[PDB]
Design a protein around this ligand. Structure first.
Ligand code: NA
Ligand code: NA
Length: 242
């Protein structure tokens, strides 16, 4: 029986959430893809889902994956970006979902994309517990003092409305999937510029886990037979702004 860490999300629960009144029961896009993939394997994979987080805010996804290395988890299943600092310590499947950082801002500001954001000294929103915090500091050398953690689409919307003057932000940097959910309920804001990273979401296992290999060929079967699209459309189909 594999102990599988699952992030205890407080927001964008379409991706994955703990079913209310349970410890070990989860639902969402990521759970459905995991389940569909495992069922395509020719051996049984018994699983216990173990919640990772205090349940008050989204957990550190990097610290979550780090629990595989200490042996606390046999695997992590969730909306987990396949980024270098994680791939060096655990083995991911190939991505089951496309992701990548975008800039979200109000229309017709000085923010035209990630480069404009770097040239300026405005405060930047990112999602609590995201790798995005680390990409901004280390890869793009953005100052720690500019970075504002936001937990939910309500907080996103408040931060963008208040703006830099009133303790909010000029823009938020976050993965496209959360930004698409955010905008479908908050059409006053837009993506400006393009995706400037392209790391997908994958299932995480210990270094040399054959599960990482096998599930990648399950993901190909899910892609071809159209179940990936079907499971996307079940959870994430939303009313667009344009
Ligand atoms: Na799609
Ligand atoms: Na549903």
């Amino acid at each position: 029986e594999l102990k599988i860490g699952v992030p205890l999300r407080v927001s964008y629960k379409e991706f994955v959430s703990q079913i209310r009144g349970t410890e070990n029961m989860f639902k969402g896009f990521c759970i459905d893809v995991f389940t569909a993939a495992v069922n395509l394997l020719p051996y049984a994979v018994p699983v216990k889902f173990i919640p990772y987080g205090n349940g008050k805010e989204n957990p550190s996804y990097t610290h979550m994956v780090e629990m595989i290395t200490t042996g606390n988890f046999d695997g992590v299943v969730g909306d987990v970006a396949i980024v270098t600092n994680r791939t060096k310590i655990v083995d991911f499947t190939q991505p089951y979902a496309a992701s990548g950082l975008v800039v979200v801002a109000p229309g017709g500001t000085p923010i035209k994309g990630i480069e404009s954001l770097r040239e300026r000294d405005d405060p930047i929103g990112y999602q609590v517990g995201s790798f995005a915090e680390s990409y901004l500091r280390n890869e793009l050398n953005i100052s720690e003092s500019r970075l504002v953690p936001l937990g939910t689409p309500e907080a996103y919307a408040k931060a963008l409305k208040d703006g830099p003057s009133k303790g909010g932000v000029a823009a938020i940097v976050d993965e496209r999937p959360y930004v698409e959910l955010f905008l479908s309920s908050n059409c006053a804001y837009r993506i400006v510029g393009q995706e400037f990273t392209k790391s997908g979401w994958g299932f995480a296992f210990p270094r040399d886990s054959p599960l990482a290999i096998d599930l990648s060929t399950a993901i190909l079967e899910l892609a071809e037979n159209g179940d990936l699209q079907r499971i996307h459309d079940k959870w994430l189909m939303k009313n667009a702004c344009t």
